[PDB]
Write a protein that binds this ligand. Sequence first.
Ligand SMILES: Nc1ncnc2c1ncn2[C@@H]1O[C@H](COP(=O)(O)OP(=O)(O)OP(=O)(O)O)[C@@H](O)[C@H]1O
Ligand SMILES: Nc1ncnc2c1ncn2[C@@H]1O[C@H](COP(=O)(O)OP(=O)(O)OP(=O)(O)O)[C@@H](O)[C@H]1O
Ligand SMILES: [Mg+2]
Ligand SMILES: [Mg+2]
Length: 331
Amino acid sequence: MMAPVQKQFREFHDRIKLAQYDENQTLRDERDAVLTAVREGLKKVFADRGEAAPTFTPFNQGSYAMNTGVKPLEGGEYDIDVGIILNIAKDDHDPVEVKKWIRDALKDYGNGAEIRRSCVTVFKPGYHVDLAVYADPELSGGTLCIAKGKENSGDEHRLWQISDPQGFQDRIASKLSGDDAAQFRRCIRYLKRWRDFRFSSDGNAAPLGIGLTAAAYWWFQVSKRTDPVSQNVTYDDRDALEQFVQTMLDNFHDTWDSKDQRSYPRLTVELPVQPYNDVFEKMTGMQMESFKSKLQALLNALKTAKSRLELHDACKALADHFGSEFPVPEK
Ligand SMILES: Nc1ncnc2c1ncn2[C@@H]1O[C@H](COP(=O)(O)OP(=O)(O)OP(=O)(O)O)[C@@H](O)[C@H]1O
Ligand SMILES: Nc1ncnc2c1ncn2[C@@H]1O[C@H](COP(=O)(O)OP(=O)(O)OP(=O)(O)O)[C@@H](O)[C@H]1O
Ligand SMILES: [Mg+2]
Ligand SMILES: [Mg+2]
């Protein structure tokens, strides 16, 4: 019979997983260090304006909130995502200015902050902290809005955009339960490691993380077998990946670009909560074309790894796409 690869996938998962905030004191302390720095820095920033400093409530975001986090490859960075809800009315402030408050509060913290379009990012050895900045729903008419725009942006691109990070997190947590949900999370992690191994450490692959998470929300399906007599359950991560990758490939659509006078294959993945935006929208057509090609190569490898006699060969085919922490037994 063909060599199975489930034990190797579970070993691979053990190597790449990074514990979520609730189980990771190091991440909680690094998060809280950035949060304490912003409180102190705001004291100083606003004593300088004759105004009382604003208060904020933080909340966990991203993969370390959703338990979909992976360890970076050597040289890569961890990504601590957090939301802060300032006690301010959105109609009374420009979003970029509010993010300036936060950046200035984190001037002399670590490697200094940086105002990015959707967050303030502070850099420290081996990780960065992505602070998404929101206005208070109570003071802003009932809705939760994130500060969009950077110092580069014109008036068209400075806005307070409706956002539902807790509804998104709830949907990821609630789609499945128990060991079904564990396999869902494993497969998200496997594809994040594939991202880090086969796409560059620049931001062209920056939307892959959230994109693959939202893709899995729409399209992942469990693969397990239940013995009709013993009721014993075994999971098949290789097959779950094969079905999911094939479904992603099925949803690419050839999309004409009038500027370039050609089509590019594009995968649109809507966020399942507000603002329902295509989380892959920033990827260029040429990057989409490369993404599709690499997903197809991954799919071909997943199929090859089903049909090898030797476990070494099945695992080698997988490690060509998942990298050198995918275990490959000797022949
Ligand atoms: N393009 C986007 N559209 C909507 N929400 C987004 C988008 N990008 C990020 N987010 C929100 O911000 C959170 C943090 O974004 P990030 O890019 O760090 O993804 P992640 O889920 O943490 O995955 P990774 O492990 O790759 O960091 C996301 O989980 C999501 O809630
Ligand atoms: N709705 C969102 N909520 C929270 N974080 C987000 C959201 N959208 C994007 N991000 C995150 O913020 C970081 C950068 O934001 P963005 O995607 O705007 O890139 P940028 O380089 O700041 O802007 P751009 O690339 O458009 O010039 C990424 O990690 C991304 O995942
Ligand atoms: Mg993240
Ligand atoms: Mg991030």
